[PDB]
Amino acid sequence: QPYDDSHCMERAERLIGEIKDMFNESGKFCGENAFERLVMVDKVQRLAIDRHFQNEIAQALDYVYRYWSDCSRDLNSAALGLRILRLNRYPVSSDVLRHFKGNDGQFLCPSAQSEEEKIGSILNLYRASLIAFPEENIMDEAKAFATTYLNQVLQNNNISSHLSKEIKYNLEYGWHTNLPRVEARNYMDIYGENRSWTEMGGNMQILNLAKLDFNIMQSVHRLELESILKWWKDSNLDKVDFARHRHVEYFALACAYCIDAKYYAYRRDFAKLCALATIVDDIYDTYGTIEEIKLFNEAVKMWDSSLPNSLPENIKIAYKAFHMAVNESAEAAKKTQGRDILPYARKVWEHYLIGLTKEAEWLANGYIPSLEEYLENGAPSSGYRVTMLQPTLTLDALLPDNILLEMDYPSRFNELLCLSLRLKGDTRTFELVSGISCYIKDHPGSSEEEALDYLKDLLQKRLKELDQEYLKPNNVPAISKDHAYNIARSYQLLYKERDDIKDLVTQILLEPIPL
Numbered sequence: 001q002p003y004d005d006s007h008c009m010e011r012a013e014r015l016i017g018e019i020k021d022m023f024n025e026s027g028k029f030c031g032e033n034a035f036e037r038l039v040m041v042d043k044v045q046r047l048a049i050d051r052h053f054q055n056e057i058a059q060a061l062d063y064v065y066r067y068w069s070d071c072s073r074d075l076n077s078a079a080l081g082l083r084i085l086r087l088n089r090y091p092v093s094s095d096v097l098r099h100f101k102g103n104d105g106q107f108l109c110p111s112a113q114s115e116e117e118k119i120g121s122i123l124n125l126y127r128a129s130l131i132a133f134p135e136e137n138i139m140d141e142a143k144a145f146a147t148t149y150l151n152q153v154l155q156n157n158n159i160s161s162h163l164s165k166e167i168k169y170n171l172e173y174g175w176h177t178n179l180p181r182v183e184a185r186n187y188m189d190i191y192g193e194n195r196s197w198t199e200m201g202g203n204m205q206i207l208n209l210a211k212l213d214f215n216i217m218q219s220v221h222r223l224e225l226e227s228i229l230k231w232w233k234d235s236n237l238d239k240v241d242f243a244r245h246r247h248v249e250y251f252a253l254a255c256a257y258c259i260d261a262k263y264y265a266y267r268r269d270f271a272k273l274c275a276l277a278t279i280v281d282d283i284y285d286t287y288g289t290i291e292e293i294k295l296f297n298e299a300v301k302m303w304d305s306s307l308p309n310s311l312p313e314n315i316k317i318a319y320k321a322f323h324m325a326v327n328e329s330a331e332a333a334k335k336t337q338g339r340d341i342l343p344y345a346r347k348v349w350e351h352y353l354i355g356l357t358k359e360a361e362w363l364a365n366g367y368i369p370s371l372e373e374y375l376e377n378g379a380p381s382s383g384y385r386v387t388m389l390q391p392t393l394t395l396d397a398l399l400p401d402n403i404l405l406e407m408d409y410p411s412r413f414n415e416l417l418c419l420s421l422r423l424k425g426d427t428r429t430f431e432l433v434s435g436i437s438c439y440i441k442d443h444p445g446s447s448e449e450e451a452l453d454y455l456k457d458l459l460q461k462r463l464k465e466l467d468q469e470y471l472k473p474n475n476v477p478a479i480s481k482d483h484a485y486n487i488a489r490s491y492q493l494l495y496k497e498r499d500d501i502k503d504l505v506t507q508i509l510l511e512p513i514p515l
Contacts, residue, residue: 006216008212008215008216009216011208011212012209012212012213012216015205015206015208015209015212016052016053016209018202018205019044019053019202019205019206019209020053020056022201022202022205023037023040023053023056023057023059023060024056026040026060027059027060027063032067032070034063034064034067034068034070034071035071035077037060037063037064038060038061038064038071038077038080038081038084040060040206041057041060041061041064041084042080042084043191043203043206044057044210045057045084046183046184046187047184047187047188047191047206047207047209047210048180048181048183048184048210048259049184049206049209049210049213051259051260052213057088061084061085061088061090064081064084064085065090068081068085068092072096072099074100074109074110074121075107075108075109075110075121075122075124075125076109076117076120076121076124076125078096078097078099078100079097079124079127079128079142080124080127081096082094082096082097082128083124083131086131086471087131087471089473089478094132094133094136094138094139095138097125097128097138097139097142098138101138101141105141105144105145106145107122107125107142107145107146109122115158116159116160116163119150119153119159119163119167120163122145122146122149122150123146123150123166123167123170125142125145125146126142126143126146126147126150128142129142129143129146130143130174130176131175131467132464132467133464133467133468134461134465147171150170150171151171153167154167154168160194161193162189162190162191162193162194162197163194165186165189165190165193166190169186169190173186176420176463176489176492177489177492177493177495177496178489178493179253179256179257179486179489179490180256180257180486181214181256181257181259181508182256182493182504182507182508184210184214185214185507185508185513187210188207188211188214188513191203191207192207208515211513211514211515212515214512214513215512215513217255217259217260217261218255218508218509218512219512220261221251221255221267221508221509222509222510224251224264224267224268225248225509227268228247228248228251228268228271228272229248231272231325232247235317235320235321235324235325236317236321237275237279237317237318237321239313239317240279240314240317240318241314242279242282242283242286242287242314243279243318244278246275247271247272247274247275248271248505248509249494249501249504249505250270250271250274251267251268251270251271251509252504252505252508253270253490253493253504254266254267254270254271254391254490255267255508255509256490256504256508257482257483257486257489257490258270258483258486262396263394263395263396265329265332265333265394266391266392266394266395266483267391269325269328269329269332269390269391269394270387270391270487272325272329273325273326273329273386273387273390273391274383274387276318276321276322276325277352277383277386277387278383279318279321279322280296280318280322280352280353280356281356281383283296283315283318284296284353284356284357284359284360285356285359285360287314287315288312288315290360290364292311292312292315293357293360295307295308295311296315296319296353297353297357299319299323300346300349300350300353301350303323303346304323305320305323306319306320306323307319307320326342326345326346326349326390329345329390329391330342330345330390332394333345333390333393333394336394336395336396336397336398337393337398337399341390341393344389344401344404345389345390345393348385348386348390348408348409349386351380351385351409352380352381352383352385352386354380355377355379355380355381356381358377358381359377359381359433362432362433363432363433366432367433368432368433368437368438368441369433369441370438370441370442371435371438371439371442372442373438374433374435374438375419375422375423375435378418378419378422378426379414379415379418379419379422380409380418382418382421383421384414384417384418384421384422384487384488384491385408385409385414385417385418388414388417388483388484388487391483392407392480392483392484395479395480395483397477397479398477399477399480403474403475403476403477406474406475406476407476407480407481407484412469413466413469413470413481413484414484416462416465416466416469417466417484417485417488419459419462419466420459420462420463420466420488420491420492421488421491422435423435423455423459423462424459424491424492424495425495426455427452427456427459428495428498428499429499430498430499435451435455436448436451436455437451439451439454439455466485466488470485
């Protein structure tokens with residue numbers, strides 16, 4: 001073969017084999033060991049090496065679910081199993097947390113736990129409470145108790161460096177403003193700095209596999225980044241001026257959950273269509289005559305390869321790049337989807353421009369819509385769906401039109417995905433038509449603060465609906481739904497970072513982890 005496996009790859013493939021053996025061993029164990037298998041799933045999942053053990057994890061969680069009433073004997077294991085089983089789409093209930101709920105909103109650890117073990121139990125409680133479904137008030141109580149408790153722990157020191165780091169990480173990132181490889185990069189340090197953890201069982205093999213896989217795949221992604229930089233140069237977007245160097249940030253976001261080398265079309269197309277979507281938004285919003293907006297819309301509806309050779313050079317090159325990127329992505333998607341998807345794809349972009357055009361009309365006409373009208377048009381206009389559909393269609397999971405209507409527009413999943421992006425953006429303390437203003441118009445005399453609180457709360461509620469819908473089973477390939485969901489998470493994380501994203505680019509793309 002022209003290219004050999006690198007020595008890191010060989011070491012990783014050997015470690016994968018040994019860890020599969022550990023998974024099969026605990027399965028052969030004559031006896032109930034649901035927690036032990038749960039704890040092993042936990043480690044390889046937090047370290048985001050779980051894609052190498054899909055059969056071994058499925059067998060372990062099937063066994064954990066079967067023995068679930070056995071496994072959930074204390075606060076720690078109930079909270080851990082609740083989060084992991086739920087995130088993997090088993091029908092488990094937050095009621096399991098009631099067995100440990102006492103008075104004054106306090107939750108109960110076994111009394112023989114060391115202080116460090118108590119903190120570990122509460123962290124798993126905190127981590128579980130973040131995956132809340134609508135009407136699970138036990139989750140809000142769990143989150144509130146664990147927050148107050150974990151903050152008190154930090155106030156007093158008395159705790160080790162690695163455990164202290166674990167609290168701060170978990171409190172700062174939560175679940176929604178977070179991504180798998182972000183968590184994995186943090187747990188390489190949280191586990192690796194824990195002497196007792198590294199000394200136990202096969203933990204060191206698991207950690208080294210995670211470091212190896214991180215460094216291996218980062219170098220694949222750093223290679224792919226080159227091709228993206230060439231596209232920026234070739235397309236002349238480097239001269240757009242009104243453009244912004246953010247195609248690298250978007251690429252890194254995608255890398256922090258779409259990992260495998262075969263999914264380079266997904267990674268590439270998310271970074272391009274998302275940077276394009278940002279460019280097109282700045283055109284329709286800030287720079288460009290209503291004439292030119294109309295010509296753009298006409299060009300898109302006709303799918304012209306080019307705009308009138310009279311329009312400003314900026315709008316001219318942005319259109320060409322747009323038309324080309326979309327075409328390439330659809331050709332990529334024809335390979336996996338085994339069908340033409342350019343027609344479908346074009347309708348998606350049309351719906352996006354229709355949405356951005358309406359906001360242009362409104363600002364031009366002094367029209368302040370009602371909040372409900374704003375949010376409904378805000379779904380296609382946020383740009384979520386045009387950064388999501390085409391890249392997802394290039395994955396190796398067929399989304400037949402029948403099933404697309406369950407992930408794409410007009411599905412409830414897609415609608416909750418868009419509202420998360422829209423509501424998060426419209427709640428940033430970083431405009432005549434906004435979430436704030438439309439609300440004020442809907443509620444005369446409302447304070448600007450009074451509007452912020454209502455949209456912040458509504459986002460909390462929509463996120464819970466989103467999660468319930470995300471984890472509800474259907475005939476839709478999970479990997480497709482996971483990518484769509486992780487896009488929305490990447491955007492939540494992006495807004496957290498903007499309000500550093502550069503550190504996130506460095507960790508994901510540029511700097512390897514010392515072994």
